[PDB]
Write a protein that binds this DNA or RNA. Structure first.
Lengths: 158, 91, 260, 178, 54
RNA sequence: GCGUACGGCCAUACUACCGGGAAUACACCUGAACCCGUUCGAUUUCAGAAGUUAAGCCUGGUCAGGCCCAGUUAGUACUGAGGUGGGCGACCACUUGGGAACACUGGGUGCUGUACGCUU
RNA sequence: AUUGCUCAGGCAGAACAGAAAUCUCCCAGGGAGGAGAAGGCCAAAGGUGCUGCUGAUGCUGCGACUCUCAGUACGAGUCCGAAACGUG
RNA sequence: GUGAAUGGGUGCGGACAGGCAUGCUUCUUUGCCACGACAGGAGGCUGUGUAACAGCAGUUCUCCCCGUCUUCUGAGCAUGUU
RNA sequence: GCGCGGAUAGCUCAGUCGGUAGAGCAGGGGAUUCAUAAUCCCCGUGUCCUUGGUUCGAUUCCGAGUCCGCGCACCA
């Protein structure tokens, strides 16, 4: 595209949402990050400082460093045939606590409370499988399904 | 004379010949870059670390602290147990 | 010739609305972000703020901890619960603001357990008291929150601030916004600050209005006269209220402080 | 009794119209010779130092540059405002015309010579014309003017051209032209 | 949905629940200590059953 | 059933118009000796409590504008994979999956946390 | 940096004065401004007045990084530690 | 103002998971004394086995409550236990 | 198609790197002359092709289209 700036091809990318402008609220600042935490690197255009590069826009990393106003995150980046562990120093306005492990932690806490108290059935999370045979009394009478006559008007309404 | 310069044609094939992996995934990452206060505090903490034998006897003492109460109450409960068992019989 | 309506359906559709408490004219969100944003190295270590707000007939001070659910309030103190300590009239004064700040400081230090350790100053001077730390728990540290009020040299916001500073809370502060301070030279006048803390200005004005113009003294200051207050007992009234507060901070009824 | 209650509501005391302010304005278009004397005469009328207004856009048709001081004015409020308003309306013989009133109720009028206003010495500064703009209010109008917990005045409390005209009729006992 | 509004709301609810977790974490820690005590008891009961049946 | 202080989410909360508001309040409100600030005690600061819910605030209404929700548009548009399918093409149909949007219809018009009170 | 204020434009009004001088009120999500190309961003403000300042090279042969990328440099930029300062 | 299909990042556990107790720190916190002092009551309780919960075992037992003494900040790194 | 220059009162030329404009001739009035020309005293005459940031203002700043002229267009 014959201009590779730090914010090239980011008209739609770094645009806020419809009726979503304004600097971030206090829920963004009252969040708490610890080393090892998983975080979505999601740039906030209302804050022009500490921004990550556009190449870490939807990347989930893990926290390795916590500074006063910013946080260090380790994000994997496929270069061409490798993966490199990029280190970003991104302020906490451009990062969110990732729920990527929320279901897993819910399930683990469930199974551990099961095996600690003796109640529950220890989720194993199989897929949605085939069903069994039913006899299905089912008063309802079937509706005649079939093709219908073609009407040029009802197709090309005007 | 005039060439056909840029192309990304065989690049995924070359890049996928061998598995696309991270070189060191289990390896630790250096402490360089970590915040200076946290590095200094790790150093000083480890300096102050007690030894495993001192820690073992510390934990032993902590366990022995509330022992006169615990053993007494437990033996009282154990004494009252057979009455409970004989009452549960009558059910 | 009509006016091209500007509050269109498209105007209303594309219009984004301010925050609720900003529409209410109540929250300064820039100062809020700057004050409450805690260093990410202090994982869930809140910043306690002395939020001080004022109305026409009352002065509220609160130790506040901002959380995502809401703000958690520790040891509030209002300038209408001074009567149970013996400050019956002249509430919302500079004297009343100092009194309610001192009440808040005593209350928070009790709730925390630092009341008998950090006492601050009991005979209210006008000078600088910075809460000196001791061997064990450091003094409670809170940060001033003025909100939408205007800061001026001699405001009741800073009367409350001086109240809590003397009560023992380690609020960072300079004297640059106190009645004694002279911006030109850069120096305080502890005597004029003390006189304003004990309402020497109000008492002197009332003595002046009794000397001359003995009709404005009943136009204004009518309930000063309705109560048993007199120009000359105001200062020791506020002194006794300070003593009573420091005696029983967490008092809610008159049976605690009086009838003894 | 709906009618009784609503008549008493609109006959509340807090609905008495006052004079929020009176603005004395002298736009000369010049930059210091006549402008200093305009400032002096307006500070003799009012009792406070005036404020000097500069030109927005250089207009080579009115001989005004940008940032060049071209006018002077003063905002009086209260006792001297009522007095000076009475003086101006006396100059105009307490008659006024309906067009002089705004859609929001505020009104105005300009006079050509100020000596009649009770100013003694003419030639030290010179006859100066000026604009008296009177802005009305009721007690309660500061809800839009303050900063914390500010709202905006309700339609019942806002003053209109009709009641502004009738108030200027009753007080000052005057006339309003078509 | 997948709206920015929906995603931001889900994140705000996540942060709310993390806050409530940290708010009731002491009580939870007491409960979990008692639960580990009961797990100790269960393990030792199983051990006694095995040693008596052998 | 509510008030105030601080909030979180930031219109089901906004905008306009028409009404009602018990208590605590909040608010308008009164003055300028001081602290302080102004061209103007308007804002602001200080000091008060004579009056008023008139406005602010709260609350009720509106097939109001907006916003939100559900239906519906619609298995329509689009589309991954497939064919020695059709067609001169333009493009279309089929097989196997995924599957909207505007519009239209109708309904709704903040929830709530901490503290201090009112209502008792 | 504190702090106060709110912009484009518009209705209405005021001697000369008019389309356009200055003043007043209401409306105005930004249709202004932020040096410049375009894009993004921003309203008790990353706008602007006043004022105070010099943090316009964070002491070093001083760090980890990011864009570029060969994961080289220059450059540009983010994040830190602590001396000394500005403003509050 | 909406927004697919196809896509991209991350996560999906040990038999290293998860829980529990304790230590250290010049870092953080108001959060130290304290690796301290004191301490009552109720109880067919707890576990394995069961929809018949019968039966069987007793381990510093269960609850008020991980109590009170103003009441005990986190983080990082370790020591043990399961 | 390429590169460049130019459009300013009736004619010809200045002013073209932002605070409204000139020179000569011309045209209109008066005078000298018997009368015209020369000569003397005066006067008006230009939205600076047309279109946009316009720094507060543009002939004078950039940006397109018109109108006029110039040069280049080779080995083919």
């Amino acid at each position: 595209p014959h201009s590779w700036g730090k914010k090239a091809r980011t008209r739609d990318l770094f645009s806020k949402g419809f009726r979503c402008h304004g600097r971030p609220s206090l829920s963004t600042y009252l969040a708490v990050f610890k080393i090892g935490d998983y975080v979505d690197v999601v740039t906030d255009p209302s804050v022009q400082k500490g921004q990550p590069s556009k190449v870490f826009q939807g990347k989930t990393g893990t926290v390795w460093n916590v500074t006063p106003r910013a946080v260090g995150v380790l994000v994997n980046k496929r270069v061409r045939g490798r993966i490199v562990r990029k280190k970003i120093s991104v302020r906490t306005e451009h990062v969110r606590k990732s729920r990527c492990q929320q279901d897993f932690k819910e399930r683990v806490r469930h199974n551990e409370l099961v095996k600690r108290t003796g109640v529950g059935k220890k989720i194993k999370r199989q897929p949605v499988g085939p069903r069994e045979g039913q006899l299905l009394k089912l008063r309802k009478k079937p509706i005649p399904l079939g093709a219908k006559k073609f009407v040029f008007s009802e197709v090309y309404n005007f | 004379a005039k060439s056909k310069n840029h192309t990304n044609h065989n690049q995924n094939y070359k890049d996928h010949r061998h598995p696309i992996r991270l070189k060191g995934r289990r390896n630790q990452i250096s402490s360089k870059g970590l915040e200076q206060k946290l590095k200094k505090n790790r150093k000083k903490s480890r300096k102050g670390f007690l030894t495993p034998d001192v820690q073992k006897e510390i934990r032993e003492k902590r366990s022995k602290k509330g022992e006169a109460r615990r053993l007494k109450s437990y033996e009282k409960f154990k004494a009252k147990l057979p009455i409970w068992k004989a009452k549960h019989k009558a059910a | 010739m009509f006016v091209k309506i500007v509050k269109n359906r498209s105007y209303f559709s594309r219009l984004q609305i301010k925050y609720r408490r900003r529409r209410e004219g109540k929250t300064n969100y820039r100062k809020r972000r700057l004050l409450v944003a805690q260093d990410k190295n202090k994982y869930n270590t809140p910043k306690h703020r002395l939020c001080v707000r004022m109305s026409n007939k009352d002065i509220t001070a609160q130790i506040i901890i901002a959380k995502i659910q809401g703000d958690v309030v520790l040891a509030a103190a209002y300038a209408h619960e001074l009567p149970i300590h013996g400050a019956v009239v002249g509430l919302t004064n500079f004297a009343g603001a100092y009194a309610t700040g001192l009440l808040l400081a005593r209350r928070i230090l009790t709730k925390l357990g630092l009341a008998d350790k950090y006492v601050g100053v009991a005979e209210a001077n006008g000078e600088e008291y910075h809460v000196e730390a001791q061997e064990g728990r450091r003094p409670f540290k809170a940060f001033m929150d003025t909100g939408l009020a205007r800061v001026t040299t001699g405001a009741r916001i800073f009367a409350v601030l001086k109240g809590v500073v003397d009560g023992g809370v380690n609020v960072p502060h300079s004297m640059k916004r106190f009645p004694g301070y002279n911006r030109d030279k850069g120096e305080m006048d502890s005597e004029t600050l003390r006189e304003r803390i004990f309402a020497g200005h109000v008492a002197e004005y009332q003595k002046m209005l009794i000397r001359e113009e003995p009709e404005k003294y009943q136009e204004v200051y009518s309930q000063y006269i309705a109560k048993g207050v007199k120009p000359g007992e105001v200062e020791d009234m506020w002194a006794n209220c300070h003593a009573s507060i420091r005696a029983n901070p967490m008092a809610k009824l008159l049976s605690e402080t009086f009838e003894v | 009794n709906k009618a009784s209650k609503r008549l008493k509501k609109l006959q509340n005391p807090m609905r008495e119209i006052r004079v929020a302010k009176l603005i004395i304005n002298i736009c000369v278009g010049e930059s210091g010779d006549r402008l200093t004397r305009a400032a002096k005469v307006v500070e003799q009328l009012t009792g406070q130092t005036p404020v000097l207004s500069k030109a927005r856009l250089t207009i080579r048709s009115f001989n005004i540059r940008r940032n060049e001081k071209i006018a002077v004015h003063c905002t009086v409020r209260g006792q001297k405002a009522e007095e000076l308003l009475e003086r101006g309306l006396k100059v105009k013989e307490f008659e006024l015309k309906k067009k002089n009133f705004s859609k929001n109720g505020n009104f105005g009028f300009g006079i050509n010579e100020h000596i009649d206003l009770g100013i003694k010495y003419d030639p030290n500064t010179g006859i100066y014309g000026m604009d008296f703009y009177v802005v009305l209010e009721r007690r309660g109008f500061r809800v839009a003017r303050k900063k914390r917990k500010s709202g905006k005045v309700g339609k019942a409390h806002k003053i209109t051209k009709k009641e502004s005209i009738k108030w200027f009729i009753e007080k000052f006992d005057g006339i309003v032209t078509d | 949905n997948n709206c920015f509004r929906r995603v931001y709301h889900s994140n705000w609810e996540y942060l709310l629940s993390l806050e409530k977790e940290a708010d009731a974490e002491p009580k939870q820690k007491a409960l979990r200590y008692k639960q580990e005590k009961k797990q100790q008891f269960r393990e030792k009961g199983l051990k006694l059953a095995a040693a008596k049946t052998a």
